[PDB]
Amino acid sequence: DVYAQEKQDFVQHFSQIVRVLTEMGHPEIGDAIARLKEVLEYNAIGGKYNRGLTVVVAFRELVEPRKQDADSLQRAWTVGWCVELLQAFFLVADDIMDSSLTRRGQICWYQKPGVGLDAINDANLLEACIYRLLKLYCREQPYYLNLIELFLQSSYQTEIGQTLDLLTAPQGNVDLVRFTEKRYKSIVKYKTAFYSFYLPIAAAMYMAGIDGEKEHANAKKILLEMGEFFQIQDDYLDLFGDPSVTGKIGTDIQDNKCSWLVVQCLQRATPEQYQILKENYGQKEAEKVARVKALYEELDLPAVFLQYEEDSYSHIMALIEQYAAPLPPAVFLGLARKIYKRRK
Amino acid sequence: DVYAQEKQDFVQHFSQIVRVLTEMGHPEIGDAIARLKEVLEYNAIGGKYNRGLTVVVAFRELVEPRKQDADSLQRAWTVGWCVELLQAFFLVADDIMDSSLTRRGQICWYQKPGVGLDAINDANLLEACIYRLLKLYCREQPYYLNLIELFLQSSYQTEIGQTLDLLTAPQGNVDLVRFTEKRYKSIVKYKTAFYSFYLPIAAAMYMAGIDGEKEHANAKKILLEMGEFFQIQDDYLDLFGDPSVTGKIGTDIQDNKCSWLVVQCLQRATPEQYQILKENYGQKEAEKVARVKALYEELDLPAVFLQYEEDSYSHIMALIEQYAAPLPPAVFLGLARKIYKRRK
Ligand SMILES: O=P(O)(O)C(Nc1cncc(-c2ccc(OC3CC3)cc2)c1)P(=O)(O)O
Ligand SMILES: O=P(O)(O)C(Nc1cncc(-c2ccc(OC3CC3)cc2)c1)P(=O)(O)O
Ligand SMILES: [Mg+2]
Ligand SMILES: [Mg+2]
Ligand SMILES: [Mg+2]
Ligand SMILES: [Mg+2]
Ligand SMILES: [Mg+2]
Ligand SMILES: [Mg+2]
């Protein structure tokens, strides 16, 4: 597993990241820099680092070994950490917005005593650190502007997606007719697929001098479909995953979300089951959440997910055969192996 | 008043801004684009537009009339609106973090029914719109990267400042010893002075081809001091301003903030008054807030502010004599006239 190979060096670059962002010229901001170090240590560390690692792995596979010198590698590990900072920004904010309880095996940052809504600022600081790192490591490289624009555009797309997520899930307002497959695909494309799948591979592409519109469009055809699958898996794991593996408690039913689970339910339900769903969805009561889960189990949605995972894998692999060239297929296969059969 | 001169054209460019950000290629995101239009209309409109207008006014004074063609002006009005979008991002988030009630004469966006913490996303979308506009209007200009970096750096500095604001004001944790003049100056420099004063003038400087390190450092010496004064005035108006002019209810005492008022109080108080301050600061109770205000009145802080405003004006005007050249002094005088004697 190429992610295992690269992982140790990537994780150890984090001290470096923390040291370059937390230092000398302005001691008047030291208390703020100390707080940033706490935010970084609590929120950017404890995941799987798959999005950032995808940058590094892809870079190694796209760049000739002769061009993978010491400084080129520091830049690739830095840009990977930029992706992880992006994720950390997003998760901190999303946990607030979703009223989540745990994340990565610990209490959400905003739930910690003495943090609360100051987390809004902490999150945005994480976002700022991306642009600082790109400037400190990549400003003299011919891909600098391409990466700045990629991160900014990926944030915009992701924020548009999140707007669709929140709008399709108004609190205390159950209208099941909104929850369609078409709407679902739109939400997940924007909220998850661009940043989680296109972004890291595209960053590596740009670092390797692959800036062509056509090469980017082809990669995207693979990567956005991978991303859809990933978010479907995320939705399934929200309810049916083991939290000691996922590291977080699910909130989709209580938060009235347009999950893949509820879309599948709606496609299968009898009128009677529809009414049960309607009376019990989008509400905080533990027994109403439990009724919805029982309904999903009654309608064999775990088995449906397992079948969808098989079919989607196949479809993605077909897209790799179709759209990988002229890049090495391993770039996409490494990422597919990571996500398929994930229960994490 | 040069701000009055420029204002009408600037405000009417807002329809244009809204039309270019809210349209054709992706109807799947229309609901999100509709929501963005609502956010823009509620939050970016109803202020004084002074920060954005400073861009336009400065641009006109720094660029030869022969170079102030139709497209150059659209770009300058767009970059002004980018500054206003930045402000709107910041105010939406800050109102949440400060538990504020009103802003610009209406209920804060997050307090509106059916908004709540979804405002965190709405705020960040406003931030994203800045980079979209810079790309759509300025990408082929030799100052493009300079402006991207300026906005990003100004956001970072502002977020560092906000971190110092929140840290020096922990909820329910009164320690008056933290509230020093030195700490105060640091907070306001970072949280307010960079983005409100250096940013708009520097953007115009860059648009006019003035990119020199020395020219920027000189402007900054004026503009950061102006910004300190502005935030002192903001702190004074938090308590002693008329909300029908300011458009917002103050929260500094309840929120335990390191305001200029509390720093001045601490410098003047007897041990007995110190104890009163200590027992009544940083608490939600209306009568405790009222006691603090009575103490500030007893210690003549309104008269102290009026004297400080005179001395600061003088000092700023001295800095303009010192540091304006080779730019026209009017660039700085127009902005000083706007802020001095402001009660708004
Ligand atoms: O990890 P989670 O299961 O909570 C997923 N989290 C997730 C997935 N994709 C995008 C986001 C996201 C991105 C930006 C956000 O806010 C921007 C201003 C920060 C909020 C959430 C968050 P989701 O809530 O969609 O099930
Ligand atoms: O208009 P207000 O009186 O509320 C002032 N508002 C203000 C002044 N300077 C900076 C900010 C600001 C900037 C960024 C923020 O959050 C970033 C993630 C958005 C929050 C607040 C907010 P303050 O709270 O400092 O008295
Ligand atoms: Mg979530
Ligand atoms: Mg969410
Ligand atoms: Mg989820
Ligand atoms: Mg405030
Ligand atoms: Mg504030
Ligand atoms: Mg204030």
Q: Are A36 and A125 in contact (CB under 8 A)?
A: yes
> Residue A73 CB: number of other CB atoms within 10 A?
16
Cis geometry, peptide bond prior to residue B243 (ω within 30 degrees of 0): no
Q: Are B82 and B130 in contact (CB under 8 A)?
A: yes
A96 touches chain B (CB under 8 A): yes
Alpha-carbon distance of B259 to B277, in angstroms, equals: 13
Amino acid identity at B305: F
Which residues 6+ apart lie within 8 Å of B228 measured at CB? Answer: B185, B188, B189, B193
Residue B56, by phi and psi: left (phi above 0), alpha (psi -120 to 50) or beta?
alpha
**Considering only CA atoms, which residue is closest to atom 12 of ligand 1?**
A90
The single residue of B94, B240, B268, B288 carrying the catalytic annotation is B94
Its sign, for the CA torsion B308, B312, A28, B54, is positive
Which residues 6+ apart lie within 8 Å of B5 measured at CB? Answer: B57
**Considering only CA atoms, which residue is closest to atom 10 of ligand 2?**
B191
Q: Are B252 and B261 in contact (CB under 8 A)?
A: yes
Q: Are B67 and B116 in contact (CB under 8 A)?
A: no
- The whole domain housing B189 covers 1-344
Alpha-carbon distance of B118 to A253, in angstroms, equals: 17
Give the CA-trace dihedral at A41, A44, A49, A51, to 10 degrees: -160
φ, ψ (nearest 5 deg) of residue A325: -65, 140
Alpha-carbon distance of A165 to A183, in angstroms, equals: 10
Q: Are A99 and A112 in contact (CB under 8 A)?
A: no
Contacts with B29 from chain A: Cβ below 8 Å = 160, 164, 186, 190
Cα nearest neighbour of A171 on chain B? B114
Alpha-carbon distance of B55 to B82, in angstroms, equals: 10
Give the DSSP per-residue string, A174-220.
Answer: --GGG--HHHHHHHHIIIIIIIIIIHHHHHHHHHTT---HHHHHHHH
B132 touches chain A (CB under 8 A): yes
Alpha-carbon distance of A168 to A164, in angstroms, equals: 6
Contact at CB, B121 and A32, closer than 8 angstroms? no
CB half-sphere exposure, A102, CA atoms < 13 A: 15
Of A97, A116, A155, the CB nearest to B128: A155
Q: How is residue A283 written in tokens? A: 């509400």
Q: Are B108 and B100 in contact (CB under 8 A)?
A: yes
Amino acid identity at A14: F
Which residues 6+ apart lie within 8 Å of A223 measured at CB? Answer: A193, A197, A198, A201, A332
CA distances from B10 to A322, B14, B80, B126, B200 (A): 50, 7, 8, 18, 14
Q: How is residue A11 written in tokens? A: 């994780």
Of A128, A162, A182, the CB nearest to B156: A128
Cis geometry, peptide bond prior to residue A65 (ω within 30 degrees of 0): no
Cα nearest neighbour of A116 on chain B? B97
Single out the residue of A2, A20, A97, A19 nearest to residue A57, CA to CA: A2
Q: Which ligand is nearest to the CA of B192?
A: 2
Q: How is residue A152 written in tokens? A: 């900014």
Single out the residue of A260, A253, A263, A250 nearest to residue A287, CA to CA: A253
Helix axes B70-97, B119-138, angle to 10 degrees: 160
Name the residue of B111, B162, B237 to mutate for ligand 2: max ligand atoms within 8 A of Cβ. B162
Alpha-carbon distance of B257 to B260, in angstroms, equals: 9
Give the DSSP per-residue string, B171-205.
Answer: TT---GGG--HHHHHHHHIIIIIIIIIIHHHHHHH
Instruction: Give chain A's radius of gyration (CA, Å).
Output: 21
Q: In a 10 Å sphere around its CB, with 0-12 CB exposed, 13-18 middle and 19+ buried, how is residue A141 labelled?
A: middle
Q: Are B173 and B282 in contact (CB under 8 A)?
A: yes
Q: Are A116 and A96 in contact (CB under 8 A)?
A: no
Q: How far is CA A1 from the centre of its chain?
A: 21
Helix axes A2-21, A70-97, angle to 10 degrees: 80
The single residue of A95, A98, A122, A238 carrying the catalytic annotation is A98
Query: Strand locations in A41-88, DSSP E?
Result: none
Place of tokens 């560092």: B160
Q: How is residue A126 written in tokens? A: 């994480």
B330 touches chain A (CB under 8 A): no
Alpha-carbon distance of B179 to A304, in angstroms, equals: 60
Single out the residue of B84, B105, B107, B85 nearest to residue B96, CA to CA: B107
Strand, helix or coil for residue B277 = helix
Closest ligand 1 atom number to CA of residue A235: 26
Single out the residue of B307, B62, B39, B309 nearest to residue A159, CA to CA: B39
Give bridge partners of residue B103 from the DSSP assignment: B106
Number of independent structural domains in chain A: 1
B115 touches chain A (CB under 8 A): no
Whether the CB of A124 sits within 6 Å of ligand 2: yes
Residue A341, by phi and psi: left (phi above 0), alpha (psi -120 to 50) or beta?
left
CATH number for the domain that contains residue B272: 1.10.600.10
Query: Using the 8-state DSSP alphabet, how is residue B116 labeled?
Result: G
Experimental method: X-ray
B117 touches chain A (CB under 8 A): yes
CA distances from B152 to A127, A177, A245 (A): 10, 41, 37
Cα nearest neighbour of A119 on chain B? B97
